[PDB]
């Protein structure tokens, strides 16, 4: 298995400078040194005939050869696609890791400027990552750029593959359009409680499809090829490809709303399927994404991915000037974007309209008879307050950009960290019995950018998850404990390559998750205040031998249910008509306030 780990990193080795069989027949069109797009269809069925290739090659030694063989002449960011859901699904490739995907290829992670001077200067190399800040979206360039951020967002997309057809893999995805929905919704929730920090509004949707967009230059090269991802200027708007018209775009906008009114969706074949309660949020991402398992992909479209793609190519719509698409084309680089999230509160506001056609939660639902939770302290150096610093971080790049007889190549960046911290819940279980519980754990900001408070049903769109976990209750007093460590939306631990040649790369071995590093949003100098909420239900009515759950909240379970029954979100899913969040407090709820304080 250590053998088997040294040749899964061999697969992932100097994949820019990598590059027939039967079974490679219908692979190999994207050209080596083009930039791949997560989300245009034909890039993506290519990507699929090659992870079929190595779906179905006979045993582990089989799929290596046959992918030793593509990376001579397939384009190297779809084989590293194709290889990472390989290694994630072959059951003989349990247990391995694949490499982090930022050290494959490094340069879309560090701006061209610190490769370049890498590529520039046998001792170690070492290049620390000056200008005017005009613009003020820059002020969250630390969110947006971050490396680990960047890194899932590439992992979550091959852990829930948009052309997943379940019938080929024989295995379900559970959920996954619901899961669509609820992590695209907590980036957005979370890029919020940034925005907020910094003293910014909360962003504004991208849903008219005239607006001209405001620009965003990523700094990044290809070095593949030497292209480079193109910038977009400030002021162009979107315009029509070869292969989508914007007004198409705009027709299954149209047709998804009428629906979501209606109550139903319209099937292939003409029959109307409701969008109940249970399933119906599950159908909505499916058909909005859009994924093989939408139920109509002729009338409802795919609007969100070729959004992606219109977004990417609009500095050259029609490919005329022979100009590689922008960050919006690729699961890694796109949160590095300013419009992405503009784009993704539009589509989550598709979403927010179905959820306002379901009744508000009736207190049966939320509370938990008997369980009363009386008390919730945050415990760190000062109790109930969390700091957060900026802190230094080093990337090897040796593994990806070509480091000739120099030893070691690392680029130094900073990103957003956070003091540790445990919680401590005071619950009273005033049954006879032992209860079990699930500990449902979230932070939503007190007040907008201009100091007024956020009403109830508003902090449905920015509480961020922190938490979920069993716990079990003794007749009487508990004091439940938690570590911020062992929250269930992050990554606990990412082997380096190095690691994993070595056997220092260490069942938790998925690489879909939040970073550690950005459990809590920034905050400010002076302390910005942060409603905590805990919500305590019964684990008997929750529940549905699990690998890969160190991230469950946000990357579901290996080969398995998503483990809570209830709905994505909960409580926050739902319209809540009360006006103060305190008066929508059941007995199992509770709410402390905490602030967050960023040392400069
Ligand atoms: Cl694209
Ligand atoms: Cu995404
Ligand atoms: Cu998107
Ligand atoms: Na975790």
Same mark, same amino acid.
């Given at each position: ?10 697969? @992932? !080795? ?28 034909? =890039?993506? *069925? ?18 290596? *050869? ?9 384009? *190297? ?48 190399? /070492? ?26 967002? &590439? ?41 907020? %920090?910094?003293?910014?509004?909360? +962003? ?24 480079? #991802? ?18 198409? +775009? ?27 309660? /249970? ?12 994924? #093989? ?6 009338? #409802? ?6 959004? =992606? ?18 960050? +919006? ?21 598709? @979403? ?15 509370? @938990? ?9 945050? =415990? ?41 911290? %445990? ?34 049903? *508003? ?32 990554? %606990? ?7 994993? /040649? ?19 949003? $920034? ?5 910005? !205040? ?8 019964? &684990? ?19 080969? =398995? ?27 199992? +709820?509770?709410?402390?306030?905490? $602030? ?5």
């Amino acid at each position: 298995l250590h053998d088997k780990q040294i040749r899964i990193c061999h697969l @992932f !080795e100097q994949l820019s400078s990598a590059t027939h069989s039967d079974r490679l027949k219908n692979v190999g069109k994207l050209q080596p040194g083009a930039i791949f797009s997560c989300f245009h269809p034909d =890039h993506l *069925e290519e990507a699929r005939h090659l992870y079929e290739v190595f779906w179905e090659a006979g045993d582990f030694n089989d799929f290596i *050869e046959i992918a030793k063989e593509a990376r001579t002449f397939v384009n *190297e960011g779809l084989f590293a696609f194709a290889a990472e859901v390989a290694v994630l699904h072959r059951d003989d490739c349990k247990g391995l890791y694949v490499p982090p995907v930022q050290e494959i290829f490094p340069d879309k992670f560090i701006p061209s400027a610190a490769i370049n001077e890498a590529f520039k200067k046998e001792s170690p190399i /070492l290049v620390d990552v000056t200008g005017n800040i005009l613009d003020p979206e820059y002020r969250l360039a630390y969110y947006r750029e971050d490396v680990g951020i960047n890194a899932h967002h &590439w992992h979550w997309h091959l852990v829930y593959p948009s052309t997943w057809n379940p019938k080929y893999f024989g295995k379900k995805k559970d959920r996954k359009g619901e899961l669509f929905y609820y992590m695209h919704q907590q980036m957005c929730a979370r890029y919020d409680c940034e925005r907020l %920090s910094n003293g910014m509004h909360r +962003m504004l949707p991208f849903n008219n499809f005239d607006e001209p967009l405001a620009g965003y230059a990523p700094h990044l090269t290809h070095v593949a090829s030497g292209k480079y #991802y193109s910038p977009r200027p400030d002021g162009l708007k979107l315009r029509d490809l070869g292969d989508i018209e914007i007004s198409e +775009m705009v027709r299954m906008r149209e047709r998804i709303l009428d629906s979501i009114h209606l109550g139903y969706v319209i099937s292939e074949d003409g029959s109307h399927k409701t969008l109940d309660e /249970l399933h119906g949020t599950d159908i909505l991402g499916a058909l909005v994404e859009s994924s #093989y398992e939408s139920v109509n992909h002729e009338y #409802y479209g795919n609007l969100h991915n070729w959004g =992606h793609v219109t977004m990417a190519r609009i500095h050259d719509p029609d490919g005329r000037f022979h100009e590689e698409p922008g960050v +919006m084309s690729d699961t890694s680089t796109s949160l590095r974007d300013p419009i992405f999230y503009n784009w993704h509160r539009f589509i989550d506001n598709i @979403f927010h309209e179905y959820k306002n056609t379901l009744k508000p939660y009736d207190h049966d639902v939320l509370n @938990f008879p008997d369980i009363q939770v009386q008390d919730v302290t945050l =415990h760190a150096r000062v109790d109930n307050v969390v700091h957060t610093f900026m802190r230094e971080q080093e990337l090897e790049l040796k593994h990806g950009i070509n480091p000739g007889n120099a030893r070691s190549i690392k680029a130094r960046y900073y990103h957003l960290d956070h003091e540790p911290f %445990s919680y401590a819940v005071n619950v009273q279980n005033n049954s006879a019995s032992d209860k079990h519980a699930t500990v449902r754990i979230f932070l939503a900001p007190k007040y907008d950018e201009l100091g007024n408070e956020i009403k109830a049903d *508003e902090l449905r769109r920015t509480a961020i998850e922190l938490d979920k976990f069993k716990t079990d209750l003794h007749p009487g007093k508990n004091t439940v404990v938690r570590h911020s460590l062992d929250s269930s939306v992050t990554l %606990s631990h990412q082997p380096t390559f190095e690691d994993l /040649l070595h056997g220092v790369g260490l069942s938790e071995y998925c690489s879909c998750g939040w970073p550690s590093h950005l459990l809590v949003p $920034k905050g400010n100098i002076k302390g910005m !205040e942060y409603h905590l909420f805990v919500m305590l239900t019964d &684990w008997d009515k929750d529940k549905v031998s699990v690998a890969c759950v160190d991230a469950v909240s946000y990357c579901g379970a290996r080969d =398995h249910k998503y483990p809570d029954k209830k709905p994505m979100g909960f409580p926050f899913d739902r319209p809540i008509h009360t006006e103060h969040i305190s008066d929508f407090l059941t007995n199992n +709820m509770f709410i402390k306030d905490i $602030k967050i304080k960023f040392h400069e």
